[PDB]
Design brief:
The structure is a homodimer of 99-residue chains.
Chain A (H helix, E strand, L loop, with lengths): L1 E2 L6 E6 L2 E7 L7 E2 L9 E7 L2 E15 L2 E9 L6 E2 L1 H4 L5 E3 L1
Parallel strand pairs in A: 3-8, 4-7
Antiparallel strand pairs in A: 2-3, 2-6, 5-6, 6-7
The structure holds the ligand CC(C)CN(C[C@@H](O)[C@H](Cc1ccccc1)NC(=O)O[C@H]1CCOC1)S(=O)(=O)c1ccc(N)cc1.
PDB class: hydrolase/hydrolase inhibitor
Keywords: HIV-1 protease, E35D, salt-bridge interaction, Natural polymorphism, HYDROLASE-HYDROLASE INHIBITOR complex
Assembly: dimeric
């Protein structure tokens, strides 16, 4: 699709069998999702946002559907205002910015 | 242009007579620029994301050139670690997400 930006670019994602809402976020390198159970091990990651740096859980090679497109990659889990899909997964679904 | 998301979507902007580098950010409601002086009245605002909140000054009816395109709108100014062009100005230059 072509998504205009008059409203928040919210899409439906599917991860761990659960449907959630997430924001398509070109301003984030990484993908951050609110607390949930994911399979396998995690490793520590520090990420920086507008308020500063926080610690999150990094799960690699997670299967996640994003607006109907399958991606498999790194998902960070931690305290976020909204689930955010970052460039690591936007590139997998073939997303570009155009004007 | 069509901007790939392999790297950060950074562009050159001109605001208040100054050239700056800024992130094209679909995940941001508003535009927020590292602290600088702007003309006219302002009011305080709190904005929050990863790492919590920061206090900023809200200036309305500010003209910015974004990669050569003039747009006008609200600009927030404060201690952001990165210059952010948010949806309120991305819409004005006709920016869309496509996949
Ligand atoms: C958290 C989202 C929902 C909203 N933000 C935009 C996001 O793109 C934000 C932009 C940014 C990048 C680097 C440093 C600081 C900020 N990226 C971000 O945090 O990257 C983290 C998460 C994964 O990778 C690292 S915001 O800055 O908090 C914000 C809030 C309100 C307004 N009016 C404007 C901006």
């Amino acid at each position: 699709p072509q998504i205009t930006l008059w409203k928040r670019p919210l899409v439906t994602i599917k991860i761990g069998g659960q449907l959630k809402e997430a924001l398509l976020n070109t301003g984030a390198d990484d993908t951050v999702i609110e607390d949930m159970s994911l399979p396998g091990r995690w490793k520590p990651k520090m990420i920086g946002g507008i308020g500063g740096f926080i610690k999150v859980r990094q799960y690699d090679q997670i299967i996640i559907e994003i607006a109907g497109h399958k991606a498999i990659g790194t998902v960070l889990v931690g305290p976020t205002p909204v689930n955010i899909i970052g460039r690591n997964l936007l590139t997998q679904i073939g997303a570009t910015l155009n004007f």
